[PDB]
Every structure is written in C-alpha cells, then in structure tokens.
Design a binder for this molecule. Structure first.
Ligand SMILES: *[C@@H]1O[C@H](CO)[C@@H](O)[C@H](O)[C@H]1NC(C)=O
Lengths: 46, 50, 49, 50
C-alpha cells in the first residue's frame, strides 16, 4: 500500500535494463569459461 | 550475512518516506492544503502562503 | 452591554447569509483575520461566536 | 472540501463518530456525504509518464 501512496504523490520506480535471468546467464558463462579453459579465455580465444 | 545489500535497499526506502512526510509541513503558512488557502483568501494576500 | 461585561451569543445550525449586512449606516470598520469578506460566504464553519 | 478525483463506494469501517479518513501522507482519503451518511473513497484519476 506504501507504493500506491508514493505513486499518488508523483514518485515512481523505473525497472532495470537487464533482468535477473540475463545476469544469471552472464555468471554461468563466466563460470563455464573458467572451469573449462582456466584463464585463457580472458586474454583471447578459449 | 547479506546486510550490506539490504542496507542499500533500506536507505532508498527511508529517503522516499521522508519526502512524503514533508507534504504535511506548512512552513509558516496558515495551512498545508493549497485548496483551503485559495478558497479562504483573496489573491492579493493569498500569494504569500503559496 | 458594557465592554467590561460584553455579551456572547452562540450561533449554530442555520444558513449563514453574510450578504445582507450593508443595511446600517456606513460602518467604519469591517476587518477580517484569516479569511476574506469579498463575498466569501461559501465556506462551512463548526460554530459561530 | 475542494478536490478532484474519482468517487467510489468504500469498505472502510468508519465508526459513527468518525467523519473523514486520511492516508499515510496525511491527506484526505475517504469522506462522508452530509446528505446520506455514506462513506466514499477518493482516488485521483489516471495519469502517467510518456
Ligand atoms: C435532511 O438531511 C437528510 C440527510 O441527512 C435528508 O434525508 C432529508 O431529506 C433532509 N431534510 C429535508 C427536509 O429535506
């Protein structure tokens, strides 16, 4: 109910551009890269 | 364990709350509601409250 | 009454029409505080003294 | 009381002595009709950003 009270005074919240699934996808990609390639994928090809 | 992140969230909430609570202050005027000021005073002397 | 024994009258439960008061001799003083008299009989009050 | 908005039938349990309601921001939220003693909720009509 507090959100509606704030909204009726002109105060609102904008959503982020990246969703939580996308951030989890980044984390999974980083984890897979480090597990299968070590540190080679951070300097060039994996 | 996750206090730091929670702190961030809490801070933002607090700020918003404070801002809303500032709408009940009259800052030395006769009332906190603009409609009352306009419906009780003639415009030459109603400008100071607004 | 005398100023040291001024009379107080309670006004309630009626229709307050302030239009018809300019019927005596031209009154020197008609001054309002917190409200304006320029045809502002459109407000509703709790009690009148 | 002068305002603008949408009037609907409210489920607030005003007890017999209570006349009008207020929200968190300390502004009028519900009112009572002085001709039918009915409780009416007040809500600003729709708005948003473009
Ligand atoms: C007095 O007000 C009531 C509502 O409170 C209404 O029902 C009634 O008709 C009014 N009296 C007259 C004589 O119209």
């Amino acid at each position: 109910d507090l959100i509606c009270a704030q909204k009726f005074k002109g105060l609102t919240v904008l959503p982020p551009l990246l969703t939580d699934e996308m951030i989890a996808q980044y984390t999974s990609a980083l984890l897979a890269g480090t597990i299968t390639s070590g540190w080679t994928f951070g300097a060039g090809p994996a | 364990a996750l206090g730091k992140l929670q702190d961030v969230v809490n801070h933002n909430a607090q700020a918003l709350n404070t801002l809303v609570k500032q709408l009940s202050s009259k800052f030395g005027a006769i009332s906190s509601v603009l409609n009352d000021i306009f419906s009780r005073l003639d415009p030459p002397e109603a400008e100071v409250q607004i | 009454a005398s100023v040291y024994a001024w009379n107080r009258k309670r006004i309630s439960n009626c229709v307050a029409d302030y239009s018809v008061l300019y019927n005596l001799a031209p009154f020197f003083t008609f001054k309002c505080y917190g409200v304006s008299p320029t045809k502002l009989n459109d407000l509703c009050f709790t009690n009148v003294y | 009381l002068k305002g603008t908005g949408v009037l609907t039938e409210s489920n607030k349990k005003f007890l017999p002595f209570q006349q009008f309601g207020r929200d968190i921001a300390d502004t009028t939220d519900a009112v009572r009709d002085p001709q039918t003693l009915e409780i009416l909720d007040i809500t600003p009509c729709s708005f948003g950003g473009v």
